[PDB]
Paper text:
Lysyl-tRNA synthetase (KRS) couples L-lysine to cognate tRNAs, and is the only aaRS that has evolved in different organisms to fall in both class I and II. LlKRS folds into a canonical eukaryotic KRS and contains N-terminal OB fold anticodon binding domain and a C-terminal catalytic domain. We discovered that cladosporin is a very potent inhibitor of L. loa and S. mansoni KRSs, and has enzyme inhibitory IC50 values in low nanomolar ranges (~52 nM and ~97 nM respectively).
To understand the atomic basis of KRS-cladosporin binding, we solved the crystal structure L. loa KRS in complex with cladosporin (CLD) and L-lysine (K). The isocoumarin ring of cladosporin is stabilized mainly by π-π staking with Phe344, T-stacking with His-340 and hydrogen bondings with Asn341 backbone and Glu334. In addition, guanidine group from Arg563 and Arg332 also stabilize the isocoumarin moiety. Gly560 provides hydrophobic support to tetrahydropyran ring (THP) whereas the Ser346 lends suitable space for its methyl moeity. The L-lysine binds in the inner region of active site pocket and is accommodated by series of hydrogen bondings with protein atoms. The active site region and binding mechanism of cladosporin for both LlKRS and HsKRS is remarkably similar, with only difference of Ser346/Thr337 (Ll/Hs) and distant Val329/Gln321 (Ll/Hs) substitutions. It is clear that the residues Ser346 and Val329 provide extra space for accommodating the methyl moiety of THP ring, and they thus contribute to species selectivity. The drug showed concentration-dependent enzymatic inhibition and revealed IC50 values of 52 nM and 97 nM for wild type LlKRS and SmKRS respectively, while a significantly higher IC50 value of 1370 nM was observed for the human-like LlKRS mutant protein.
Author numbering:
A (entry chain B): 5 to 151, 154 to 362, 370 to 449, 462 to 507
B (entry chain A): 7 to 69, 73 to 147, 156 to 362, 369 to 446, 464 to 505
Write the structure that this text describes.
């Protein structure tokens, strides 16, 4: 196996030591493989256009020997394949047909100048009069009985060669971001960009990355959310602000977590969160119907191999749930609406239900995670979070101890977080400040923030759902696996 | 100051059981669509059968009739407060002392057009959605951009342009069959251009990582794996420090095309930049003022193809009036490369000396977009060697108004890549083979500098340093 790489490195080095270049500079591609197949489709069985010369290029996936005149190569380019039929009668070169095809192995990248033809068996093909080896493949490719686990992630290029469904997998993701962007842009949004390095890295409930910026003699935090900036932009007269971009969080690596992930956040003035619900429903529905043709798609937690199947249904309207009602019915207890008390801290802690620093907000997050969240397979709205875990959401017009935040869960994971933005410069902040605050932001609020609805979504996670991948590493080209 | 008094009034209103910051005001139509809708209305007519609800920030207040100039989006609309149409308990006196300039207000009112032709809305009710607790005015505008956007509403136009620029680029490459992808911004060993990287720590892996200084190597691996045309627009992190053309964090656009040489990327860059310039402005030839407060000198950048092509050796040999040695890696050529008498002037090696010489003598001649071609192999490790002139690379740079905005080359196709520098997972990927390919990259912030006609990169950036 290694000796085969040694062997071909010998052949390539002796080819370069005889004055020949194994890695050429420029090959002219006359027609695209796709454009080739769509064209010459009118070909007949065993016809060859010898008066027409086309130049096509690609990677050799398989080599089939006929033991003489004919040698068959299956050429993969982009998403299509074309059979280059090497016939000795059509070879026009001062390379002997025998020695030449010892030079081209499987995996090698070749250009081809040849005649469009369709063989007697009907195979659409190009018959080269000349073959130029564009790149040698110095390694041994798997025999299609192989090509998995950890290796696929570390060496993505190989995975894309052997498993084209990864390629379709990512194409779908890019077409997704294209769709979302063309949607928001159709809604009058303006895509902008915010600093990824801040003095305080506001604002989200995670741990940030710390780096050092040399010019200023000071340390900076990588952004955990574009929020505070987008809101300041809303203050300045931009009514609809929109940003798709990455976010850096220091939380450990998981199947649903990556330290750096793509987040889409947008802020819309003169709307409450009840508007954003009727937006998220619309968007997710039309996106699902856009991609798969139907509103109801399957998801497999196991990995598409006889595991329990969740039947994700994106038809509007998604069911609505409260935190207090659902947790009260699940646990069978009565809670206090405003719970900033230590005496109230004993109550949440007392009702552990053996689920797992203990504060009211961390306990509540844990209680919700354990009891309410795993029930969510079909998309579900989770409404009315406390103010202790939602500092930047405006207070509820009715319940004194709740906020207008809502989350959206699909297959037991949170892909969307939104709220009605707090325009009040009297903002009470977290006392303990443990693992979870900008002076210039409150002063931006003093100039005034219109009634606003902020919204955010994990892009990689929606890609996970619509890709049917149990691991986030499958929708990321180069994940954090190490 | 004035903030103490208004926070006093708002808080004293807060202690009487009133909500100073309402939750939802239902806006019927945006101001733009309003003026566009009722521009055809007759004059001296007031429409009583139509009730519209528009909201915005009050730019100015002038006091029977009280005049508000309401700024929404990129348009303003005249709110005409008449006491005869007030439908409230207050009766027009107490109420309009509560709303000052800078306040964000909603308005439910009647479309009307005065005899003078001025289009206006007459509110029957005014709901103050947010108070402005500070006093609006008559270098810190980079620190506080929200106030800049409030006082100078036209600044938005620059950033809108940037968006409509990137969108254009996105619509261009997507028409060519390109696939927008995204690559990790954190690497153990950040490959790419020549700069200093950021060092950060990742706790889960308990290791030090480098922020990406270029999407280069990753995109090249993506091309290896069968993706023929790749492109990534995204932010990039360099530790070199702040300047007028430099910001530590800037937006870069790169694309890679298999089966293309660098002359194809030149004949493309010409095409794209031409069509985009004609798209934004009215002609291929635009103005530029490198002195912002001032007005002289005025460059006359011309985007009409074909841009001038220049070599490093020919142009620097003619400009300096001496003949250089051929492309030699050796120590001997560096002694010639000093040129202390020329006083062009850190560690000085043949590559850094050559770069400073280009920077002083050759580069300032570039006003119209100019291709600067054939850099040595000592300054271009990832560019393939020149097919004709040895010891040279197929790299080229593009300069406009004496600054570098795009860099492209024919990617090094040989896994015998000599990366030795004096003062891995990538090379093993090249062994599986990289088709003959052409890479391309561009600073987005700098093309925004040109097309916004700003001498400062902070003027095309929302929150600079
Ligand atoms: C932009 C945010 C908004 C809230 C939902 C979702 C949460 C986000 C949290 C998060 C943290 C982390 O360390 C790694 C990750 O992959 C994610 C994620 O995908 O989802 O995305
Ligand atoms: C990807 C490259 C290609 C060439 C133009 C442009 C150069 C780039 C260099 C650069 C270095 C730096 O430390 C700070 C900056 O703002 C820039 C920049 O904007 O432009 O982007
Ligand atoms: N920082 C939030 C996402 C943005 C929410 C804005 N409404 C989170 O991840 O929890
Ligand atoms: N490393 C390049 C950017 C990538 C160019 C690839 N053609 C630079 O000088 O910034």
């Amino acid at each position: 196996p290694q000796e085969y790489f040694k062997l071909r490195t010998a052949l390539i080095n002796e080819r370069r030591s005889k004055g020949i270049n194994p890695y050429p500079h420029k090959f002219h591609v006359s027609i695209s493989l796709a454009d080739f197949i769509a064209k010459y489709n009118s070909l007949e069985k065993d016809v060859i256009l010898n008066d027409i010369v086309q130049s096509v290029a690609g990677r050799v996936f398989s080599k089939r020997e006929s033991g003489g005149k004919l040698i068959f190569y299956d050429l993969h380019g982009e998403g299509t394949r074309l059979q280059v039929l090497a016939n000795a009668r059509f070879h026009s070169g001062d390379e002997a047909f025998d020695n030449l095809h010892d030079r081209i192995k499987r995996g090698d990248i070749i250009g081809v100048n040849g005649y469009p033809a369709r063989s007697k068996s009907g195979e659409l093909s190009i018959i080269p009069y000349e073959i130029i080896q564009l790149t040698p493949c110095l390694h041994m490719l798997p025999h299609t009985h192989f090509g998995n686990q950890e290796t696929r992630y570390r060496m993505r290029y190989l995975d894309l060669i052997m498993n084209p469904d990864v390629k379709n997998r990512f194409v779908t993701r890019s077409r997704m971001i294209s769709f979302l962007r063309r949607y928001l842009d159709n809604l009058g949004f303006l895509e902008v960009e915010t600093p990824m390095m801040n003095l305080i890295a506001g604002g989200a409930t995670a741990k940030p990355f710390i780096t050092h910026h040399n010019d200023l003699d000071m340390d900076l935090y990588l952004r955990v959310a574009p929020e505070l900036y987008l809101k300041m932009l809303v203050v300045g007269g931009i009514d609809r602000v929109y940003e798709i971009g990455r976010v850096f969080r220091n939380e450990g690596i998981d199947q649903t977590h990556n330290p750096e992930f793509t987040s889409c956040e947008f802020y819309m003035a003169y709307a409450d969160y009840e508007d954003l619900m009727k937006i998220t429903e619309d968007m997710l529905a039309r996106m699902v119907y856009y991609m798969h043709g139907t509103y109801k798609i399957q998801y497999h937690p196991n990995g598409i191999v006889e595991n329990p199947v969740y039947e994700v249904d994106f038809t509007p309207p998604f069911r609505k749930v409260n935190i207090y009602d659902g947790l009260q019915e699940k646990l069978g207890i009565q809670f206090p609406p405003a719970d900033t008390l230590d005496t109230d801290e004993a109550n949440k802690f007392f009702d552990k239900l053996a689920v797992e620093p203990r504060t009211t907000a961390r306990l509540l997050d844990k209680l919700i995670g354990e009891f309410l969240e795993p029930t969510f397979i079909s998309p579900t709205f989770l409404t009315g979070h406390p103010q202790i875990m939602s500092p930047l959401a405006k207070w509820h017009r009715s319940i004194p101890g709740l906020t207008e935040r809502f989350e959206l869960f699909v297959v037991t994971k949170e892909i969307v977080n939104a709220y009605t933005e707090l325009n009040d410069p009297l903002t009470q902040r977290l006392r303990f400040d443990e693992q979870a605050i900008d002076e210039n932001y409150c002063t931006a609020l003093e100039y005034g923030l219109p009634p606003t609805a902020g919204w955010g979504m994990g892009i990689d996670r929606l890609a996970m759902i619509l890709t049917d991948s149990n691991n986030i590493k499958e929708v990321l080209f180069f994940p954090a696996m190490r």
